[model samples]
Target: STGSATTTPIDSLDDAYITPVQIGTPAQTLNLDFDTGSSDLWVFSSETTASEVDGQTIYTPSKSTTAKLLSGATWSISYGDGSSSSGDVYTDTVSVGGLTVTGQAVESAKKVSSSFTEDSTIDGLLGLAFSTLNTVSPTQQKTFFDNAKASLDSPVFTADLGYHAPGTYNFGFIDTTAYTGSITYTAVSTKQGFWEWTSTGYAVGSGTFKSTSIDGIADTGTTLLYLPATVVSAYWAQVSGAKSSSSVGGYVFPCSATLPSFTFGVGSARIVIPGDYIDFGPISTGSSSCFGGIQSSAGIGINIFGDVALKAAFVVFNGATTPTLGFASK
Candidate 1:
């Protein structure tokens, strides 16, 4: 009654994690971005504007015997760059790894912005943040997790995201072998449609752990970590030659700089993120300046503990009536 799916970081930079998903009665498989920050199982489909299907495969609803169109249903999501992808909805048998959900809403892209073509692989997003975040209209349907939780053995899922390697997304039950030590469980606000939790404090390198309330959301869909300006500047200040570059847009430092590890608190547990992980990579192909994985969240309003943070711990997203987040060292 449980399912285990391996997630591969598409590139060396870990831009996005991808998984193979089987859809329709004939079982056509396509790689999808398993994003945790949003909700909607939309795909690059036959209905998409022809020009957009460059190297990616398309999901054709007409080929499936079980594929049924939900009358007057449509979905639209925005990234605020004048980029937009909207489409119609279809319900079909959707399978991922060892689990299957029948009649899962499959949004078929009817329109895709021109800016998305150069990207290779990743047919679409398997958004699973919350059903409330689902963009489907006329009536928003439940998410894959919301639909499968009742049938799963444990009604929970966990993310073991990797740094330079592939990670695993486990559903229904947790694999005891994936993590170490005891898990620190904390209550989450399920109403806001996110895994929002508070940490007691943090420490830059071996410095004393600053005991202050730090609230943030665990967003797997994002690639970098964002916190308040105060915390972000504090981390950058520790480095010898770090700056908020005018050309770089954000903070950057020399690749030779010896960076400090960042430690974040989870209840009574502490997670230490390696200094190497904080060095995202060189700003330019041959440039010596590197971008920091952690950045300022001041403009964004909400602090996002993205993939950079998730790489340091094994996180559990409990789908119980009163959902909670569980963290353990990996």
Candidate 2:
């Protein structure tokens, strides 16, 4: 958007969102997008041209031989759901399948198309969440966790945003195999790369939506978690078989069998989100079938804990890597 400008009309951009962020190794799986309004770690640029790339997963610096290309630097990005990108900048010895990790700082979307250059795509974006929403910065540098957190084994990075059908965005180390013992901590707040705290509302099934008191910030690059309004009307009143209407912009719930269930917090860790992810794939809507996934805006202040409450758990974005600001579980 900083170069082409085209905003308005982003009805979903990536419907229900699919989060990811587990750097280095978790048995080599690299897929991340925790965009708290523009940091950086873009992907899909192998000279992209596959129907304008969507729901990305591209990384191929000619299959990295320590890929490099930061000449005459130029990179651009704009998304508030406006969708835009312009680029050129690279430096890689990247590895996610073998977990090699070496001097990795990628972003190469130089004038992309087909929407975004797809085809089992690769080579672009690996920004593990946030470092001031980093797109490689230190006087216009580059960042994918400041160049791979010094060969991570536990430089720590975790994010599991799944409350329904495969939703676990992880990173670095600390898988813990899959919870059952020791996992609960929160610190990160050197001021806005977002991982703040203060939440305790909105649920369905076990009933909750304690009349507004959310403190904000729990984003996996945000995709939906900006509640307010009596906790979004007591979380759609326990999804009583969804049925709401009014579309010119807000109020949606086309019924997916009364969906509800959500949770958030950090300082005492308590993450939850299971209602088939608000009836995600169970997709149902008929006049008021309610399955649009919360979209009510009116003044939109600030409260973005997107990706439907960060896929439920294991969220860590400890960038400076060692200090007060580290979560565990993923």
> So what's the TM-score on candidate 2?
0.33
lDDT by residue for model 2 (169-240), tens: 344565567554466565545466555555544445565434334666655544565666555666666655
lDDT of 1 by residue, 25-131 (tens): 89989888877778888889989888887888889989999999999999998752255689999999998887999989999999877755556677888887889
Per-prediction TM-score to the true structure, in the order listed: 0.96, 0.33
The worst-scoring run of ten residues by lDDT in candidate 1 lies at 77-86
lDDT of 2 at 285: 31
Q: Output the lDDT of residue 263, model 1.
A: 92
CA shift at 326, candidate 2, in angstroms?
8.6
Off by over 4 Å in 1: 80-83
Query: What lDDT is reached at residue 120 by model 2?
Result: 28
- Alpha carbon lDDT at 112, candidate 1: 78
